[PDB]
Design a binder for this molecule. Structure first.
Ligand SMILES: *CC(=O)c1ccc(Br)cc1
Ligand SMILES: *CC(=O)c1ccc(Br)cc1
Lengths: 122, 122
């Protein structure tokens, strides 16, 4: 669920994590349109394409199973649909950490009026 | 500034405050249009009309002065324009706490395609 994705972002990125990633560029948030702005916005484009392959369960409200091992997050459980949602969430938090050196404040709370070009294929 | 409105919401409502209130209904977010959905969404409509009466400084990017006394938020400083922006943010925080009994998960991360009716005037 989105409550679990928020707890995962603060463990990997620090105390101000959720406020820094809730709205950035043309793709960071639920849904999106147009073309990506930089490397950080591209991590969120891949996350939307991953949620689109899920059939039978809901990514906003359904709960999955996970554990923490000395800094490393690992997915578990026995339902195939719920485990698929946990893997989409784990891969995006590692992409945010690898690209921290190019994050730019001119793109935080950007707007939809600047995302009006022909949309990029998955 | 918008960074200050987020930190004030986490002090009054608790740890999961920013994830619950910065994306909800037709007006809690950037670029509002249409008709308010419920009581919590109407607290955000009144806050948008309050910002429109400020004529010599910018609500999105300019920083103000504030502190705490007996558990309540208090606004300060030596510039009248900046103090007016602080007062709009404090009143909205009290409206969220007074209406908590009626919050609904159906309106959390609501899509923009559901808000295309004519807009209610201030
Ligand atoms: C899918 C994605 O990138 C994303 C980013 C932030 C939040 Br909150 C929800 C989803
Ligand atoms: C004025 C108001 O309620 C509001 C809420 C969210 C965001 Br982002 C901006 C403004």
């Amino acid at each position: 669920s989105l409550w679990q994705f928020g707890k995962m972002i603060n463990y990997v990125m620090g105390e101000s994590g959720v406020l820094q990633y809730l709205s950035y560029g043309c793709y960071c948030g639920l849904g999106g349109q147009g073309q990506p702005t930089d490397a950080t916005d591209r991590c969120c484009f891949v996350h939307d394409c991953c949620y689109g392959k899920v059939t039978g369960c809901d990514p906003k409200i359904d709960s999955y199973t996970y554990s923490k091992k000395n800094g490393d997050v690992v997915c578990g459980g026995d339902d195939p649909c719920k485990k698929q949602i946990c893997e989409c969430d784990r891969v995006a938090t590692t992409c945010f950490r690898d690209n921290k050196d190019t994050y730019d404040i001119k793109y935080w709370f950007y707007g939809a009026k600047n995302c009006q070009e022909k949309s990029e294929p998955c």
